[PDB]
Amino acid sequence: SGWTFGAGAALQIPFAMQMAYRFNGIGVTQNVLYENQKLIANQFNSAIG
C-alpha cells in the first residue's frame, strides 16, 4: 500500500511501480528504474543477505 496507509485509508499499489515514486522523490526520473528493474532487484536481494 505504499505510505498511503499512514495518512488515511489504505490504497494498494504494485510494488514494481512503487519504487518509481521513491526514485522520483530523490532527483532521478522514474524511467531509470524500469530500465534496470532486474539489476536493482538483484542488488537489493544480495545486500539483504
Binding site: 514494481a16 524500469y34 528493474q37
Partner: protein, 35 residues
C-alpha cells in the same frame, strides 16, 4: 525493454490546431488550382 508496457495511441497536440488548418493549409493549395 520495460516489463508490462501496453499498446495505445498518444494524441499529438499540434494536430488539433493543425487538423483544422489541414482544412486551411491544404484547401488553400486547392483554393487556387481550380480557378
Amino acid at each position: 525493454v520495460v516489463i508490462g508496457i501496453v499498446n495505445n495511441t498518444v494524441y499529438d497536440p499540434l494536430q488539433p490546431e493543425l487538423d483544422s488548418f489541414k482544412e486551411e493549409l491544404d484547401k488553400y493549395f486547392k483554393n487556387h488550382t481550380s480557378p
